[PDB]
Amino acid sequence: KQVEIFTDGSALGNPGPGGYGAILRYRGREKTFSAGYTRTTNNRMELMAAIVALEALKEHAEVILSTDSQYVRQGITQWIHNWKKRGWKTADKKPVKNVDLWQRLDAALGQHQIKWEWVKGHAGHPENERADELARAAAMNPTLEDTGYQVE
Numbered sequence: 001k002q003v004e005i006f007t008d009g010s011a012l013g014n015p016g017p018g019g020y021g022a023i024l025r026y027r028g029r030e031k032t033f034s035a036g037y038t039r040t041t042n043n044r045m046e047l048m049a050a051i052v053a054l055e056a057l058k059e060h061a062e063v064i065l066s067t068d069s070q071y072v073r074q075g076i077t078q079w080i081h082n083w084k085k086r087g088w089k090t091a092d093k094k095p096v097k098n099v100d101l102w103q104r105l106d107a108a109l110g111q112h113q114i115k116w117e118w119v120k121g122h123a124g125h126p127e128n129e130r131a132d133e134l135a136r137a138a139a140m141n142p143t144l145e146d147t148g149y150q151v152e
Contacts, residue, residue, distance in 0.1 A: 001027065005053045005065045006127035009045025010135045015149060018042065019138025020049035021131035024056060031056065034134040036142030040149050043071045045135060047101040054108035066117040068128055073118045075102060100148040 004025040011018030019036035033052050037045070046069035053065070067073075080102065088096050088103070096102065122129040 002062045002064055003057065004127075005050075005063060006125075006131050007046075007049035007053050007065065007067045007069075008128060008131035008135045009042065009047070009049040009069070010132065010139060011040050011042045011045055012139050015039050015041050015151070017139050017142045018045040018146075019135045019140075019142060020045045020052060021134025021138065022049050022053035022056075023127050023131055023134075024053055025127075026061075032134065034138045035144055036138030036140070037144045037146040037149075038142045040146040043069075044098055044101060044146060044149060045139075046071050047075075047098060047105055049131070049135065051101065051105050051108050054105070054112065057112065061112050063112050063114045064117060065114055066119055066125070066128060068119045068121070068125075073116070075105075076116060080106065098148075 006023040007021070009018065009020040017036065017038055018040040020034060022033040024031045033056060050065065050067060050072055083096050088099050090096060119125050119128055122132065
């Protein structure tokens with residue numbers, strides 16, 4: 001009884017309009033999530049896609065989460081454990097970039113058993129390609145304010 005999640009996010013500027021797409025599959029069926037923000041970044045949308053998909057889980061699960069985001073992979077596999085040791089601050093004592101979303105992702109995660117699948121390209125990954133199409137459509141017609149976005 002595993003849940004398969006496929007996520008992607010993108011933006012059209014640095015900061016610009018952006019959006020996310022997430023696909024959840026469980027016991028044969030599929031659910032889709034997508035929303036666009038007026039001023040955000042690619043990395044924030046890559047993170048938001050995973051957050052929204054995991055927050056949709058209403059009971060503890062065994063999850064296989066597939067994403068091609070290098071940023072999410074680096075946070076999960078390289079950075080988050082050390083950021084927690086340092087109180088979510090860098091060496092210059094500033095809050096970690098996108099700390100709001102990393103902390104929200106950590107809350108959305110830790111209740112589930114997650115196997116991360118770090119995919120590279122779209123070839124052979126149709127759900128990831130569709131998640132990208134959803135994110136791009138959302139970026140072309142954004143409705144929400146990414147209140148946590150901060151310059152730099």
